[PDB]
Amino acid sequence: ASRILLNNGAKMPILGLGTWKSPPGQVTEAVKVAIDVGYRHIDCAHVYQNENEVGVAIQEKLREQVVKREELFIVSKLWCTYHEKGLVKGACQKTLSDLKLDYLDLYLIHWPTGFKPGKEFFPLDESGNVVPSDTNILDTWAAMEELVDEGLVKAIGISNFNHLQVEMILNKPGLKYKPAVNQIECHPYLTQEKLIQYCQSKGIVVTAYSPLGSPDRPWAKPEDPSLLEDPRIKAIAAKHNKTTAQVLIRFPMQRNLVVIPKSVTPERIAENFKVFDFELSSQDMTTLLSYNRNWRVCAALSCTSHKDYPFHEEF
Ligand SMILES: NC(=O)c1ccc[n+]([C@@H]2O[C@H](COP(=O)([O-])OP(=O)(O)OC[C@H]3O[C@@H](n4cnc5c(N)ncnc54)[C@H](OP(=O)(O)O)[C@@H]3O)[C@@H](O)[C@H]2O)c1
Numbered sequence: 218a219s220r221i222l223l224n225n226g227a228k229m230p231i232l233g234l235g236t237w238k239s240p241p242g243q244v245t246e247a248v249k250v251a252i253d254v255g256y257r258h259i260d261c262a263h264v265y266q267n268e269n270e271v272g273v274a275i276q277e278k279l280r281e282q283v284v285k286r287e288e289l290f291i292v293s294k295l296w297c298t299y300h301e302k303g304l305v306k307g308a309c310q311k312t313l314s315d316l317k318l319d320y321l322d323l324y325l326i327h328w329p330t331g332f333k334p335g336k337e338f339f340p341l342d343e344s345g346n347v348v349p350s351d352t353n354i355l356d357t358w359a360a361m362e363e364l365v366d367e368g369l370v371k372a373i374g375i376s377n378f379n380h381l382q383v384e385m386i387l388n389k390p391g392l393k394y395k396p397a398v399n400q401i402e403c404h405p406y407l408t409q410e411k412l413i414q415y416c417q418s419k420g421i422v423v424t425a426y427s428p429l430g431s432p433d434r435p436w437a438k439p440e441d442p443s444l445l446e447d448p449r450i451k452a453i454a455a456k457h458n459k460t461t462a463q464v465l466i467r468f469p470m471q472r473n474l475v476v477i478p479k480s481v482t483p484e485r486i487a488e489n490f491k492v493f494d495f496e497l498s499s500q501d502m503t504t505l506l507s508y509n510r511n512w513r514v515c516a517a518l519s520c521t522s523h524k525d526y527p528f529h530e531e532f
């Protein structure tokens with residue numbers, strides 16, 4: 218099953234293309250190729266500062282008659298400096314303009330943490346602490362709901378929200394739309410069993426980001442564990458005659474999750490899509506879930522004091 222049913226009645230492709238760190242000089246080609254080999258879901262963000270170039274590729278393939286707009290599932294996220302209710306529409310409309318689209322299929326609150334509005338995306342104080350904004354998850358959610366009621370986005374969701382933060386929204390008095398998706402980091406070093414259990418139990422679809430462990434993350438260290446080089450996982454890959462990446466992409470699919478591996482390398486974009494022609498066995502699944510080390514590629518120590526920092530909670 219290539220798509221998963223969302224609570225808005227729309228179907229979301231379970232494999233999408235990540236675009237964080239895809240340089241503007243190379244992401245247009247990336248998206249064009251992805252569309253060419255079957256990707257229909259592209260995961261974007263204003264903060265990735267390549268939405269223009271992603272829109273370039275999309276308009277072109279629309280122009281080329283390769284895909285139609287209704288077949289695409291385009292995701293963007295509201296960056297942290299726009300959580301004020303009076304900034305949300307503009308932030309969404311800028312994304313829409315850059316992407317040269319008239320609606321988004323899914324718009325996520327990118328992180329639960331609101332940051333001080335201004336030009337700078339990740340404002341820190343002298344001391345390297347993030348400068349928060351006086352914004353809260355429920356009003357930002359209300360702002361997101363407006364986007365749906367205005368036709369600008371078909372569905373809204375959240376990202377990097379812990380189960381209590383999700384619950385806050387769910388129990389919102391006057392809730393208009395429940396979150397359709399919770400996009401979270403998820404891979405065999407961070408298997409997220411409890412949050413997944415929670416989300417699924419509440420009818421929220423989970424998207425696994427950084428499924429290859431984000432080797433290109435700008436803050437990586439040599440000592441960190443490296444999923445793609447993990448000999449145990451290469452071993453699993455070798456037994457199925459697949460790449461480690463393909464094992465890492467297949468793993469979340471068999472957990473009823475959406476997954477969004479990133480590449481700008483045409484060969485890998487293609488490689489990464491070829492995950493619907495094998496199955497990981499019960500033991501593979503069991504073995505990969507056992508490699509959980511609660512290790513995060515995305516956890517900003519600069520935000521550990523933000524009130525809405527999601528990763529203090531167990532899940
Ligand atoms: N919601 C949020 O907070 C959030 C946070 C982080 C990520 N995400 C989304 O999740 C996407 C995926 O996560 P990510 O970008 O952090 O990292 P990832 O997808 O885990 O890893 C991408 C890295 O893997 C390399 N790679 C890709 N396919 C490969 C293959 N077959 N073999 C070997 N190396 C391969 C890529 O290299 P090349 O590109 O050079 O080929 C790149 O260096 C993002 O791009 C973004 O869309 C969302």
Ligand SMILES: O=C(O)COc1cc(Cl)ccc1C(=O)NCc1cccc([N+](=O)[O-])c1
Binds near residue numbers: 516523
């Ligand atoms: O967030 C992403 O999708 C990928 O990570 C990026 C990407 C860009 Cl272009 C800029 C900055 C980041 C990054 O530091 N994200 C981590 C993050 C941010 C906010 C809060 C937190 N937090 O932990 O509260 C963490």
